[PDB]
Amino acid sequence: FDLGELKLWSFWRAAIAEFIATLLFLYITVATVIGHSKETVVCGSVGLLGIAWAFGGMIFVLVYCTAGISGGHINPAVTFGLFLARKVSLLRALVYMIAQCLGAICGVGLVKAFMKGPYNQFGGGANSVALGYNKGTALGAEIIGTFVLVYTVFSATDPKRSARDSHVPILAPLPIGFAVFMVHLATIPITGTGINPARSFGAAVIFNSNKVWDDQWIFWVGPFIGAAVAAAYHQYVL
C-alpha cells in the first residue's frame, strides 16, 4: 500500500486502458456469442469455433494495444497472479480489478442494448455449469484452464522492458491470446468461457439470473486459485 502511486499521472491512464479494454473485450466477445445463438439456419453462424477465436483473438489484439500502457491485463486473475509475484503493487491491483470489473459490465451491458431480444433469450453470454457436469468439475476445469492462461502470461513477460513508468513487465500478446483461444476450445462445453472473473461477473450482472448467480462463485475461486498455482509453479519451481 504505497499510496504514492495514486499521485502519478500515468497510473490513472493505466486504469483507463484496462477499463476500455475490458469494455471492448466483453462487447465483441459476447456480441459474437449471441449472434451465434440467434441463428436459425444450420452452420449459418460463425460457430463455437468462431466464438473461441473471438475470445483469444480479442485478448491478443487488446494485450497488444494496452501492453505498453497498463501492461495489458484485461483480467483480474492475470492481475492477481502478477500481484502474488509482486510485479504489481497492492494499490495498483485493486484499482485494476475494479476497472476491469466496471469494464466488463459496460461491455456486456452495451450488447444487451443492441439486441436485448436474443440477448436475454440466449443465455446473455453468462457463465454457469452445464447439464451433465457437477460443480466439482466446473471448478476443476476453471482452475486448470486459468493455470494455462496465467502460466503463459508469465512465460510471455519481457524481463527487461516494462510498462511505461512502472516495473510491470511487457506482455508478448500472441501466445497469451492463443492460450485463451485454446482453453476456450476445451472448456466451452463445460461452462462456456471462463478463467476471467471480470468476464463472468460482468456477464452475470447484466443477465441477472439466480441459476447464473448461483454458480458465479466458481468463476472467481477457480480463476484465482489457478492464477495462484501458476505464479507458484513459475517462480517457486522454475
28 vs 213, beta carbon nearer its own copies = 28
- In 3D space, the residue among 66, 55, 60, 64 whose CA is nearest the CA of residue 199 turns out to be 55
User: Closest distance between its own copies and the C-beta of residue 56, in Å?
Assistant: 9
Q: According to the binding rule CB under 5 A, does residue 151 interact with Hg ion?
A: yes
Q: Find the binder of Hg ion among 28, 69, 93, 106 (CB under 5 A).
A: 106
Q: Find the binder of Hg ion among 20, 101, 176, 227 (CB under 5 A).
A: 101
48 vs 102, beta carbon nearer Hg ion = 102
| AA letter at 10 | S
37 vs 93, beta carbon nearer Hg ion = 93
User: Closest distance between its own copies and the C-beta of residue 76, in Å?
Assistant: 21
Contact (CB, 8 A) for 162 and 168 = yes
As beta bridge partners, residue 162 has: 169
Q: According to the binding rule CB under 5 A, does residue 16 interact with Hg ion?
A: no
120 vs 165, beta carbon nearer its own copies = 165
Rounded Cα gap, residues 144 and 139, in angstroms: 9
As beta bridge partners, residue 169 has: 162
| AA letter at 35 | G
CA distances, 29 to each of 8, 66, 89, 94, 193 (Å) = 33, 18, 29, 24, 10
Q: Find the binder of Hg ion among 28, 46, 91, 102 (CB under 5 A).
A: 102
Rounded Cα gap, residues 64 and 232, in angstroms: 26
Identify residues 51-70 at the interface with Hg ion (CB under 5 A).
61, 65
Q: According to the binding rule CB under 5 A, does residue 22 interact with Hg ion?
A: no
DSSP state of 169: E
User: Closest distance between Hg ion and the C-beta of residue 107, in Å?
Assistant: 8
List residues near Hg ion by CB under 5 A: 61, 65, 97, 101-102, 105-106, 151-152
